[PDB]
Motif scaffolding. Structure first.
Motif, PDB file in Angstrom:
ATOM      1  N   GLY A 144       0.774  -1.221  -0.087  1.00 27.46           N
ATOM      2  CA  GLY A 144      -0.134   0.059  -0.017  1.00 27.46           C
ATOM      3  C   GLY A 144       0.844   1.394  -0.002  1.00 27.46           C
ATOM      4  O   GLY A 144       0.548   2.142   0.592  1.00 27.46           O
ATOM      5  N   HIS A 145       1.965   1.355  -0.689  1.00 28.43           N
ATOM      6  CA  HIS A 145       2.834   2.550  -0.637  1.00 28.43           C
ATOM      7  C   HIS A 145       2.353   3.285  -1.980  1.00 28.43           C
ATOM      8  O   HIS A 145       2.497   3.073  -3.238  1.00 28.43           O
ATOM      9  CB  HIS A 145       4.359   2.075  -1.090  1.00 28.43           C
ATOM     10  N   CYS A 197      -6.591  -5.263   0.907  1.00 35.52           N
ATOM     11  CA  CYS A 197      -7.629  -4.323   1.482  1.00 35.52           C
ATOM     12  C   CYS A 197      -7.006  -2.835   1.300  1.00 35.52           C
ATOM     13  O   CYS A 197      -7.526  -1.911   1.836  1.00 35.52           O
ATOM     14  CB  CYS A 197      -7.594  -4.814   3.007  1.00 35.52           C
ATOM     15  N   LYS A 198      -5.936  -2.632   0.422  1.00 36.39           N
ATOM     16  CA  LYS A 198      -5.503  -1.404   0.261  1.00 36.39           C
ATOM     17  C   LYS A 198      -6.442  -0.564  -0.673  1.00 36.39           C
ATOM     18  O   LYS A 198      -7.262  -1.275  -1.400  1.00 36.39           O
ATOM     19  CB  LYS A 198      -4.177  -1.362  -0.652  1.00 36.39           C
ATOM     20  N   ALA A 199      -6.392   0.766  -0.450  1.00 40.65           N
ATOM     21  CA  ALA A 199      -7.661   1.451  -1.104  1.00 40.65           C
ATOM     22  C   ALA A 199      -7.025   2.595  -1.873  1.00 40.65           C
ATOM     23  O   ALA A 199      -7.378   2.591  -3.166  1.00 40.65           O
ATOM     24  CB  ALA A 199      -8.505   2.110  -0.153  1.00 40.65           C
ATOM     25  N   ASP A 200      -6.159   3.418  -1.703  1.00 37.37           N
ATOM     26  CA  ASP A 200      -5.316   4.341  -2.394  1.00 37.37           C
ATOM     27  C   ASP A 200      -4.944   4.095  -3.520  1.00 37.37           C
ATOM     28  O   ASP A 200      -4.784   4.583  -4.613  1.00 37.37           O
ATOM     29  CB  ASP A 200      -4.663   5.338  -1.341  1.00 37.37           C
ATOM     30  N   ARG A 234     -12.746  -3.063 -13.920  1.00 40.70           N
ATOM     31  CA  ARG A 234     -12.990  -2.017 -12.770  1.00 40.70           C
ATOM     32  C   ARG A 234     -14.026  -2.458 -11.868  1.00 40.70           C
ATOM     33  O   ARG A 234     -13.977  -2.381 -10.828  1.00 40.70           O
ATOM     34  CB  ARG A 234     -13.349  -0.575 -13.374  1.00 40.70           C
ATOM     35  N   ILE A 235     -15.011  -2.779 -12.425  1.00 36.81           N
ATOM     36  CA  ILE A 235     -16.204  -3.529 -11.555  1.00 36.81           C
ATOM     37  C   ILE A 235     -15.702  -4.754 -10.656  1.00 36.81           C
ATOM     38  O   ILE A 235     -15.852  -4.877  -9.612  1.00 36.81           O
ATOM     39  CB  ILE A 235     -17.530  -3.742 -12.097  1.00 36.81           C
ATOM     40  N   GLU A 236     -14.764  -5.426 -11.311  1.00 29.43           N
ATOM     41  CA  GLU A 236     -14.538  -6.774 -10.638  1.00 29.43           C
ATOM     42  C   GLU A 236     -13.226  -6.458  -9.499  1.00 29.43           C
ATOM     43  O   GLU A 236     -13.350  -6.787  -8.514  1.00 29.43           O
ATOM     44  CB  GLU A 236     -13.799  -7.722 -11.332  1.00 29.43           C
ATOM     45  N   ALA A 237     -12.669  -5.262  -9.785  1.00 25.93           N
ATOM     46  CA  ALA A 237     -11.574  -4.781  -8.638  1.00 25.93           C
ATOM     47  C   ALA A 237     -12.618  -4.093  -7.502  1.00 25.93           C
ATOM     48  O   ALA A 237     -11.984  -4.408  -6.683  1.00 25.93           O
ATOM     49  CB  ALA A 237     -10.759  -3.904  -9.554  1.00 25.93           C
ATOM     50  N   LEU A 238     -13.320  -3.358  -7.897  1.00 23.90           N
ATOM     51  CA  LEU A 238     -14.140  -2.848  -6.749  1.00 23.90           C
ATOM     52  C   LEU A 238     -14.862  -3.864  -6.081  1.00 23.90           C
ATOM     53  O   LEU A 238     -14.731  -3.703  -4.808  1.00 23.90           O
ATOM     54  CB  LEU A 238     -15.411  -2.173  -7.365  1.00 23.90           C
TER      55      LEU A 238
END
Lengths: 23, 627
Positions: free
Chosen positions: B198-199, B230-233, B249-253
């Protein structure tokens, strides 16, 4: 602190990175 | 002479810059290669005084060893660095790994191998980059040391520097024309590592230098790996890659919501519902060309939910936390697939949470699904089997019924895993033979815990038949531990290790029921270990004849009735009566000893030590062999 039923593995996560300086 | 160099090695960590002069002034000369070339181990680290000085951060000791003379420093060794051991280390490697720029520059100026790869083919550059600093890597890359050198697992400097939060290091790497699309042995291309931790700045600098998105070896895009941990940024940045399409994109969300559902470090349920709801809304963004979800058929482990193909049904499970846990598990299973390595971890964690909330049945279902997924991946699942033994023991300890098909399933899994453990032990010669033997022994212990639990669980004729079939199958491979202990010997032995957790409340060895079940399933009752003891020698050496006298009597009756000799000797030529070490056990065994002239004659032959080789029948030759 493995005694609780919570998984002993942190998140595993060593699949793609083999952790350097760890063995 | 040895102590003289040992004191110098001890003082290398200390400071004796103007104190060690008395040891060398007017000293001999022929011992230079043994004093300066002193390769000792202070706790098990093959090193020199200069190597331990660099490792501990003593450039003054290096200048001491190069005061009026010079020592060769480039030597191999296994140095136990802070956290773990590394084989094939050297002075420059250890100086770089400890973050000592001055010591590294001193070693380079005096002459050291900048490409001194270890046994694991590890360059000093990546060793520095594990704890990388800009100033320490400046001269290292300015010493014409190639940054494109691979590794044992192809973990280059860029990959580990992106994994370990070293934005300055990765900046200095990519600004000097490094390899952007480098391929690791696992398939990840330095963005998966950058998105694993998550960097955000590291991913920013890699995409800035045209890293590009390419699927790793495990069939996962870097975006999906970012959404897995679980990283978001980094997920937002990778969705802002401007070349991502929509299906990804939808499968990533959905995967991001799924990961937020079940992980201890990042656990939110509102974030899970909101991410899944954003996926649902952006999925049905147009009405026409609606991205209808393809849904795998419902699996009994996650209850019986079938994802959510509609916004109304995602709204219906908003407030129900466990429903959202199951929903997150199901969408994670659908996206990551059943063949992923890091798909079983949230299932294990959710089973653990259900176990802590005293809902064992759903815990058993989820853990069985996780165990099946891990076994189909052919991985080290001894921890999971021990977890099964622990949860079954806790179920028994609270006087809760345990479902027999669950024990049958976990017994099948344990038998299969012991089979592959035997295969791994036979295949591995000396690389990690100790680890393989440890896994084999602990897997045998878990199987015996499961057997002991299965003895205390009420089963029908068919369920007991299936469990006995599994036990019979595992007996007919004859599993053995380090000191020759068969599966009967461990259940007989009081010294068999018991897990410190709730298994202590159920599985206690020696256990009479386990031995009765094993002998009734056809155990080799006359089997011996490396020490030569049979089952009877181990059970008569039990030091507790009064506390569990009923257990001792039942197991001795079982072993005698199963047909073991009450006379066979071990490697030390001791009859078990001489090894009974207990009046009670000796009396019981002498009560059960069936007299026979054959044993008396064989023992007479052994006592007189008459030369019987090539004189008596071969079966009788063996018979006098152990009598």
């Amino acid at each position: 602190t493995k005694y609780t039923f919570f998984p002993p593995k942190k998140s595993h996560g060593s699949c793609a990175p083999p952790v350097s300086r760890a063995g | 002479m040895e102590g003289l160099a040992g004191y110098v090695y001890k003082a290398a960590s200390e400071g004796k810059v103007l104190t060690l002069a008395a040891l060398l002034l007017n000293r001999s000369e022929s011992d230079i290669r043994y004093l300066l070339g002193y390769v000792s181990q202070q706790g098990g680290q093959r090193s020199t005084p200069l190597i331990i000085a660099a490792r501990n951060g003593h450039a003054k000791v290096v200048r001491l060893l190069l005061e009026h003379y010079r020592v060769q420093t480039q030597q191999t060794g296994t140095v136990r660095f802070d956290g773990y051991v590394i084989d094939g280390a050297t002075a420059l490697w250890c100086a770089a790994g400890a973050g000592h720029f001055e010591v590294v520059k001193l070693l380079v100026s005096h002459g050291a191998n900048v490409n001194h790869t270890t046994v694991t083919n590890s360059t000093p550059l990546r060793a520095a980059c594990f704890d990388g600093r800009l100033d320490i890597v400046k001269y290292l890359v300015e010493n014409n040391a190639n940054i494109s050198i691979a590794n044992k697992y192809d973990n280059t400097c860029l990959m580990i520097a992106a994994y370990k939060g070293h934005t300055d290091v990765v900046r200095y790497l990519l600004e000097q024309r490094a390899d952007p699309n480098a391929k690791a042995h696992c398939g990840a291309t330095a963005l998966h590592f950058a998105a694993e931790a998550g960097h955000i700045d590291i991913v920013k600098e890699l995409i800035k230098w045209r890293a590009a998105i390419v699927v790793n070896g495990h069939g996962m895009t870097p975006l999906k790996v970012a959404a897995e941990s679980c990283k978001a940024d980094v997920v937002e940045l990778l969705l802002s890659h401007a070349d991502c399409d929509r299906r990804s994109r939808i499968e990533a969300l959905e995967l991001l919501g799924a990961s937020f559902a079940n992980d201890r470090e990042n656990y939110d349920i509102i974030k899970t519902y909101h991410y899944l709801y954003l996926a649902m809304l952006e999925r049905f963004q147009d009405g026409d060309n609606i991205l209808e979800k393809e849904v795998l058929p419902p699996i009994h482990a996650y209850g019986n939910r079938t994802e959510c193909r509609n916004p109304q049904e995602l709204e219906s499970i908003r407030q129900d936390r466990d429903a959202l846990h199951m929903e997150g598990l199901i969408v994670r299973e659908r996206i990551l697939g059943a063949d992923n390595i890091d798909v079983s971890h949230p299932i294990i964690y959710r089973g653990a949470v259900y176990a802590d909330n005293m809902e064992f049945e759903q815990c058993i279902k989820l853990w069985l699904h996780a165990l099946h997924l891990r076994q189909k991946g052919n991985r080290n699942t001894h921890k999971d089997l021990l977890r099964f033994a622990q949860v079954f023991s806790q179920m028994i300890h609270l006087n809760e019924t345990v479902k027999a098909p669950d024990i049958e399933c976990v017994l099948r899994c344990s038998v299969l895993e012991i089979e592959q453990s035997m295969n791994r032990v036979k295949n591995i010669s000396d690389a990690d033979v100790h680890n393989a033997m440890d896994n084999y022994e602990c897997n045998l212990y878990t199987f015996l815990y499961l057997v002991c639990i299965s003895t205390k669980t009420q089963c029908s004729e068919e369920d007991q038949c299936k469990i006995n079939k599994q036990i019979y199958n595992l007996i007919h491979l004859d599993p053995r531990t380090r000191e020759g202990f068969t599966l009967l010997h461990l259940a007989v032995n009081s010294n068999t290790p018991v897990d410190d957790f709730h298994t202590n409340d159920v599985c206690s060895f020696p256990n009479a029921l386990v031995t009765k079940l094993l002998l009734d399933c056809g155990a080799e009752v006359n089997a011996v270990d490396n020490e030569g003891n049979s089952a009877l020698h181990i059970i008569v050496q039990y030091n507790r004849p009064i506390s569990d006298f009923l257990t001792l009597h039942s197991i001795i009756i079982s072993l005698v009735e199963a047909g073991a000799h009450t006379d066979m000797t071990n490697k030390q030529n001791k009859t078990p009566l001489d090894k009974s070490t207990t009046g009670v056990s000796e009396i019981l065994l002498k009560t059960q000893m069936k007299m026979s002239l054959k044993c008396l004659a064989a023992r007479a032959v052994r006592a007189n030590d008459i030369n019987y080789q090539d004189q008596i029948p071969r079966t009788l030759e063996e018979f006098v062999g152990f009598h």
